[PDB]
Amino acid sequence: GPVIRVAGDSTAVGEGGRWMKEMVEAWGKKTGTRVEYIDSPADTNDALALYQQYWAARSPDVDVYMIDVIWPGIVAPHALDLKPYLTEAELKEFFPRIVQNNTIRGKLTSLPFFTDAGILYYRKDLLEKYGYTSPPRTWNELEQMAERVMEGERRAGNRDFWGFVFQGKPYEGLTCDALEWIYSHGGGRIVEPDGTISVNNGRAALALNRAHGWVGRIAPQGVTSYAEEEARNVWQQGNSLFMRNWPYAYALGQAEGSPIRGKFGVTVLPKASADAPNAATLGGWQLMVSAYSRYPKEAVDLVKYLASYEVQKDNAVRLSRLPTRPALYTDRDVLARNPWFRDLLPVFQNAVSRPSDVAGARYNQVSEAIWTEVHSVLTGRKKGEQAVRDLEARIRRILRHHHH
Ligand SMILES: OC[C@H]1O[C@H](O[C@H]2[C@H](O)[C@@H](O)[C@@H](O)O[C@@H]2CO)[C@H](O)[C@@H](O)[C@@H]1O
Incomplete structure (x- = not known):
């Protein structure tokens, strides 16, 4: 048959x-x-x-x-x-x-x-060890926690320990992470549902500069090559205070023989300020x-x-x-x-959607522009201000003559 x-x-x-x-x-x-x-x-x-x-x-x-x-x-x-x-x-x-x-x-x-939906994974044991009672609500808090816990864990002998891992490779997963950075700084949806290309603004630029600031500091230099699994493997071995990732990573972290079983929770990603929107990419x-x-x-x-x-x-x-x-x-x-x-x-x-409805069949081209321009900030090639200007121009060319 x-x-x-x-x-x-x-x-x-x-x-x-x-x-x-x-x-x-x-x-x-x-x-x-x-x-x-x-x-x-x-x-x-x-x-x-x-x-x-x-x-x-x-x-x-x-x-x-x-x-x-x-x-x-x-x-x-x-x-x-x-x-x-x-x-x-x-x-x-x-x-x-x-x-x-x-x-x-x-x-x-x-x-x-x-x-x-994108979520924040956090080591509850390590928050408690270092005097924190709640996971971070603001990106500044995440950075402060990550610096303190890293200092401590490195001094204690773990040279593999980082503060934060995420998806920084040039591929669609970076578009997901970057939408969360930008939207949670009040920088918008990159391309709005109505078609407006909104990304060239100071809030979106700040979001990208902030993320550059993490690279080689609270996040590994190699984070610019990380997809979901590369981030997860640092985390899962017990070597990151925080991780941005999707729900599948939870069951894997709880599996018998996981180094971090029973030691973590999850929460909404942080945001720039109490009045910014929560961001979780759909x-x-x-x-x-x-x-x-x-x-x-x-x-x-x-x-x-x-x-x-x-x-x-x-x-x-x-x-x-x-x-x-x-x-x-x-x-x-x-x-x-x-x-x-x-x-x-x-x-x-x-959860906030990427601009696939508005970009329709041109979405993959739009996303490639996003992740390449974002990746240029992460790598230090460009500042956020120049990248969001360059990204605006690229998306304008890609979507010229497209209507939803
Ligand atoms: O990398 C972006 C991609 O991430 C997620 O897809 C993961 C998924 O969470 C895993 O459970 C498994 O299926 O691998 C997928 C990557 O191949 C998002 O669900 C997806 O929308 C997003 O584009």
Whole structure:
């Protein structure tokens, strides 16, 4: 019978890829359908480029793709419209914001699978050791805490110890981190939902200068090459007071044999001042049936399974990844394992989006401009003031003649 082939989630990031292959195999066994899994690269922008090769070829060789929240406007031609396959009641079981994000010109490109928001990981043991009672609320507090704890831990003999790790590599994850820096300084959304390119302002420049200030001081010099896993590995070995990362890192830090099990919490990222907005970049992944699949009915069935209550539950409990079903945030077993899901729900619902709606199919070009100009501040090549001016110009060229 058919072989249903799935591209999604990378075995190079946490346990995601192993778990996803497990779920696909479970569906195959349940339905008596042969299945195969195709591994993806760690970085989302690399995965996009890989999947674009299949799409350009109208290739039937992948039936189902795990797609990033920032992708629907790029990938819509390559997606089977799921709208006719779901009842209105079925669709309403997902967060409306994410169903809306995944709907492009009326086409439901993909079902919501898991959501994501950037958060602050912090070492509770180390805060207590050094006389702090709460995690930092302002970036200045984060810097002051990081300097004090680093001084102490280095004096105590840990030469691997840093104050703060984050994603500073030139790739999409830096766009995520930078949106949080800029938005939390009251510098705006880089490109506003209405199309205004707002980034050339002093608050956005300050945010970027601040982040440069961390490099080689409270964060490793090598942070300019860090993606999610490189940051996580410093953190997870016990060598960082603070980390910016996504929810998946929580379950990994709590696993048996983790050096930091039981020693951390999570909270909203800091902000410049009490009147700035909280910043948490909206992430997450969706499930797309390929427009080029020869087996749309079977592929839709698998996608519905993967996005189901019990599979999302298993993702939450085992991998601490955020459900796209509001009902799971009240499930006793989800909450018992991840109490912070309740505590930070408002952070997740107020997460700030990257400018993928407004940039539509040009988003990847816009983001490449953002991460390259930001990276030039991090590396010291440019000051924030010059970078936000140069970024304004670049985005203006990229989006000239584009309307949403
Ligand atoms: O790097 C930016 C990318 O980060 C997140 O995707 C991670 C995800 O949290 C992990 O659980 C796993 O699936 O790896 C993904 C990276 O391949 C965001 O969800 C995504 O929106 C964002 O672009």
